[PDB]
Ligand binder design. Structure first.
Ligand SMILES: O=C(O)CO[C@H]1O[C@H](CO)[C@@H](O)[C@H](O)[C@H]1O
Ligand SMILES: O=C(O)CO[C@H]1O[C@H](CO)[C@@H](O)[C@H](O)[C@H]1O
Ligand SMILES: O=C(O)CO[C@H]1O[C@H](CO)[C@@H](O)[C@H](O)[C@H]1O
Ligand SMILES: O=C(O)CO[C@H]1O[C@H](CO)[C@@H](O)[C@H](O)[C@H]1O
Lengths: 445, 445, 445, 445
């Protein structure tokens, strides 16, 4: 074993083998043990990974997620597998089945949301299906007939209920909704979250990942679970969250993803003759959230800032989320060049100690940087994929290719890790993470 | 869709996806519906297909098969999945659980055997494991410690009980044991099988494959099931089969496979310091069955003949089994050149109407040729793989490469069919056949 | 015998082998015999094909072409190789060395121009160089230092002498300047070219390509050569050509390429700190010619029209030049969607009889279509490459990938043909055409 | 900057680009500057590298080499290019044109020989040709018609003049004839070469490779050039060399290659109906030299020894030549297993400090090992290729695949180095070495 890496064909085979191994039947777990249920934006990436293998099964993945959509349009971030234990907080802790008027009737789910990457998976499914012939196109088109209305209600819930003041940015009531639990982005907002009488609990996550340097701290978990108590006390009522929640942030990365997803979904709606009023609403939201992202940006570097709604203060941190405007567009030409210089330079992809030319979750030169600790440093394959795909859509073919090339180099150990140590390449988090396999499958072609 | 073929990475991913989809837990079905249990030589090819994906799981496949080995050493050709229906004849029809003193205690199996390709899978597992590092080598070596004795008992049962007169050829008591149910090889022997009072039955196979041109006939099935009645009447007693069975043939292709497998297993035994008496016995059987194969051969073309033990007559047919001596070696140089000329010329791989340069199961110029009918014509990916691997082991690197190249071209539609129409390339038999996916995975590397 | 196609590695090897074989030392011929000299836009694509093999030799190709630049900035379309004949019209016929005040010294050239794809080649060279480390970057940067001013003069001459009315479109004085000698685009303009006493001549092109269905007619060559007589009579003076040329057309495809090239060169100028005044002029021209292209388009379909300056008439034809606006952008959203539908539908890439999903030079349903006859119908790999690269730069990643995939499929016979029959795939024109090899090399990566 | 390695397609392209760049027209130089002439066994490997690009040009390479064959059948090791200097000793130093009765007319050559790998190149050319269809087959068959007799005379001269005692081993009169100028194999024989008055000279090789650690010493060159004086003094007469040469050794590696080459050429002769008497002689020589190689081997390890004819002493050294019997076969089973264990163990491919699992020219644990110094330790791609091809011909498919994989990994920097430092992988010797490019081209397929 002078070189432990796999060839492209061995790697693609092992990624497909993994994805089928994590398939419970109609949903794919995000990982074998650490995340043994369906997560919302993981499910979108899993559908992308399944599209080269089975358009029918990729569609089933999104059908299963959309069957758990709330009555008001929200897609919740966890759809729990029936009778499966081992993730905390579990269905009993959320108590949405009893408390939440809008929760679905034949599914157990969480009570918060996650980024709307789902339209992007729909586009990848359609692109695959169109290369495969008439009966496969029929399958993808029947999915659109079945779920276009549900996708619209999802986008409409985000635009009307999480952007109540039409600022063009998505408000979050939990850091988990950003997809980045312990990102330095949320530290000053979480410092203003003071738990009251928090019901006793024991973590499950650090029983599986026992190295304490790779997961959040107990104090952070106390704050994560307290926010659940605040939502539960108002029975997850959208109208009441602004009045009671101790955590209210506008997430600029989520907002930029939503801008892209609206434009993607509008293009799908035009291609497939969906209602014109829907397409118009989608294009309107795409531009509003593009403008809302650009309004946050640093006047010199173009870097995007999150916003603390309770403190009424811009949140200035050095994480990958600063590059949100690169995803959706809209910066003045001059400022977008400066932002690309930031991305490629020694604070991020050009840092000289990096093993791969990839985007660390937090800049290695930030004092918040921790090379092992979840979203505080490590390189995440899922972010590499999203940036590469969005860059290709901006027309930046060579930038997209370079990220794909380094992403595949990093993944060629076959660990399919959740995230990787930025300097040594050590695989961290869960092994056999479904969306890492999915990124590899989509890249390999 | 100007071209429906998959790239090598898409094809490898789809083959791995298939193999995991056919995994019931500790055994892989030979196909989803037509063959919903474990078959013996399929299980060996499945282990070859799993070795690039998981050495641990490839080992489990062979452990599961060897746990169904009979007390006298026989590996039976079907290990039935618990509580699974849809294949006939099923466990009730065989009745080995009640009738057969040697049947295993916690497994339902058939009562006949199949070709000993298992040593070849063990070699592929070891070759993969040695590229993967210390803990993976440990897994493969623990399997050898656990099952070397069982593999020896398998080879010893074949050599002592199916070659009672030490002729160096394996006697079969059912055409199913050849792996080629309806091969023209067995027609004259089956014409001497006269069913008595055969208990009523309904076929299951042609409920799944309904095109009558792709499966054997009802009259052929009557003979297949009558031979079961003859074995059952003597309770599957090895000592009594020569006295009662209406079908007794020496199978030269099975014999040549056994010769190769003995030499492969002896080399493994030397590499891993197995008992010297075992290695010596294996080399002895390798040479005896090589000599027994060569003794059947046509003096002009080198083609190998099967032998009808009851009629005491050589069986002269034009099938791929004629090329048995190419697998094990031993022909005089002159005659092996003539046999290769036969293989490559217009009766087989060089026939001008073939879509791919592959070996049809029956020569297209034989009057027995039927282009759709199971073993009477179609091109079988499993045979392509076996010939290519044996050719590479003879040192015929370019011949092996050409078969691999045409095999991958044929499989690039992604149907993973059981067999293919030789002229049009139409996929036939079951789709999603496990050993076809396994061949592709092993070839792609 | 069963599959004449090459593997990607064999095809890449043969493409590089061809490019080196057509290298005369400091210039590469466009083909071995039909085009045994340097052609201007072929040299740009050749530099693109050389960049993965040797950045130094790619730079030499462009240095050689630019050493032949006219004193007013024009890049002539042929740079003749020393002492080579076999192409007509050759240097004696053009007589630029004796007649043209602006012709270079110590190079022999034609007296007309060709499309400005050169900036695209510079970008590909720079992209390759930045992946190769310090010494290779220095070679490419030194080329910029040495040739930026010549590239500016080339673009300035197009913008100021071939768009003297600031309409944002390039005027041509010969069909050869379009790169598409016999395109139906020019038929109505050539119909008004009436030759006088034309000095006699013998074609060389149809001594080499003898099939008369594949090349222009004698009548067409008479008009081609007559236009030369008109230019020669005014000593190729820019100020006098408007007064005397019988052929004056605005070429919308050339104009779109110029817009793209100006934008590409402007971004290079910013990245490498070229003078601000130059970058501002390049962005000004990029916008002007983008607008000039859009001004030609059909309001329903988006199809771009050429313009006959002498007849003052829009030239409405059904060729791939209609798709000019897709290259440079600028169409309203609805009109660009309509133009893409035209491109993908049954009149072009969707035509049911096409062997590959590629853009034919003329629509197969046009009365002007001739499937073998040069630019009147065949599929040209150079156009496939240019459309796929421009599409990727628009962000249309899947559209670009499909063109690349089909172009590679078409090229996989290894003929490296100049163009291909659109229905049968028969290779046509010259074999061993340098820019077809270059496209393959750039695509295969 | 993060990964200097090339993709397989880029590497294949660059290898072909190099081979065409070293083509002088009808001969290919072994390197651009260090070896600016045709070398005999390099030309064979070059023909192998050309065969995937152009069977016609591969045949031309061998035609050129054979047009330089001596009248007695010897193929000389250098064919000098017209009017090229820069290699010493050059044609003036050899003086074969004036002194050697058997030297060719209108070619300038050296006066010594080199290993007979040529038949292997003929087989690869034929294998490629048979995949390309009728006209390409005709080119390769016409080469056989034209050159079979010259190939027979080459083999007959080796068998009759360099094995005059029918011992089945080839006698050399210069270390250069082994292809391994400064191998430790020859140190004790060179220790008895005492030069007299040697006409003065200046090396050219170490003007080009200036690092003295990478080339032989001045003292060694004095002995090399003195042996020339001894040959010249008897006008290169075969009958007189035994009486006068101070260096006479039987080369067991050369002998094994000759055995393989005789067997390969015999099979070609049968396939293409060459005269029966020739094929019988080739099989006779194949067996004789197989036996002569085995006669040298250590009875415990199988390691093959060279033999010093003057000292009448077996030459016991630890170089890759010890593995000669693995190429040609003939060892008893137990002895060959022992020799493979030596090859794979810590003295060769298993040494823990090696960067790649490749065969070093001298064992790193030998007192004679020097990691930079030519044949005293470095890893040579040409040996990797020759071992992997011969291993595949033995049927050792996995052993051949591993050597090919590691050789491709080592070559993936694109230096195409003559040899590589075994521990660091630093490229050494000449860059752009033609037979390293040829090995890559043949491997990549
Ligand atoms: O949401 C949580 O409770 C834990 O979140 C982690 O696991 C999820 C599944 O992989 C992802 O969706 C998140 O992005 C990741 O940070
Ligand atoms: O044995 C049977 O009852 C039916 O046999 C067919 O199905 C089996 C599973 O694929 C194979 O093992 C045989 O080779 C094939 O002919
Ligand atoms: O027909 C001609 O005499 C020359 O024109 C052809 O050859 C040139 C070299 O390939 C190209 O530059 C043109 O695009 C192509 O049309
Ligand atoms: O050192 C020298 O003067 C010549 O010898 C070297 O160059 C030749 C061309 O590569 C090879 O034929 C030999 O194998 C190699 O040893």
């Amino acid at each position: 074993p002078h070189d432990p890496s796999f060839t492209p064909t061995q790697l693609a085979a092992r990624a497909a083998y993994l994805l089928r191994g994590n398939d419970l039947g109609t949903m794919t777990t995000a990982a074998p043990l650490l995340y043994p249920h369906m997560w919302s934006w993981d499910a979108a990436f899993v559908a992308i990974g399944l599209a080269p293998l089975s358009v029918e099964r990729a569609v089933v993945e999104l059908d299963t997620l959309l069957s758990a959509q709330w009555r008001n349009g929200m897609i919740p971030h966890i759809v729990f597998a029936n009778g499966v234990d081992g993730y905390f907080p579990g269905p009993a802790r959320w108590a949405t089945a009893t408390l939440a008027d809008n929760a679905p009737r034949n599914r157990l789910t969480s009570g918060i949301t996650q980024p709307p990457v789902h339209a992007i998976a729909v586009q990848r499914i359609l692109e695959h299906a169109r290369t495969r012939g008439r009966s496969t196109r029929a399958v993808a088109e029947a999915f659109l007939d079945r779920r276009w209305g549900d996708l619209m209600r999802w986008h409409r819930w985000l635009a009307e209920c999480r952007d109540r003041n039409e600022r063009g940015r998505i408000t979050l009531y939990h850091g988990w909704e950003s997809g980045m639990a312990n990102s330095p982005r949320w530290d000053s907002a979480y410092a203003n979250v003071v738990p009251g009488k928090l019901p006793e609990y024991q973590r499950a996550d650090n029983v599986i990942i026992t190295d304490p340097s790779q997961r959040p701290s107990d104090g952070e978990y106390d704050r994560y679970l307290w926010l659940l108590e605040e939502m539960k006390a108002v029975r997850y009522d959208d109208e009441r969250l602004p009045s009671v929640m101790s955590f209210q942030v506008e997430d600029v990365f989520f907002s930029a993803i939503f801008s892209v997803a609206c434009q993607v979904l509008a293009e799908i709606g035009e291609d497939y003759k969906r209602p014109h009023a829907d397409v118009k609403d989608l294009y309107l939201w795409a531009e509003r959230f593009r403008a809302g992202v650009v309004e946050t940006t640093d006047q010199r570097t173009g870097a995007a800032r999150d916003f603390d709604v309770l403190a009424e203060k811009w949140l200035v941190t050095e994480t990958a989320a600063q590059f949100a405007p690169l995803l959706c567009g809209g910066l003045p030409h001059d400022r977008e060049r400066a932002l690309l210089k930031l991305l490629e330079g020694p604070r991020f992809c050009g840092h000289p100690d990096l093993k791969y030319g990839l985007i660390p979750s937090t800049s290695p030169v930030s004092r918040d940087f921790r090379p092992r600790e979840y979203w505080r440093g490590p390189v995440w394959p899922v972010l590499t994929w999203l940036f590469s795909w969005c860059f290709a859509r901006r027309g930046w073919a060579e930038r997209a290719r370079l990220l794909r090339q380094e992403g595949l180099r990093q993944a060629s150990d076959g660990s399919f890790a959740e995230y990787y140590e930025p300097f040594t390449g050590e695989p961290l988090g869960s092994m056999q993470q479904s969306w890492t396999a999915a990124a590899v499958l989509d890249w390999l072609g």
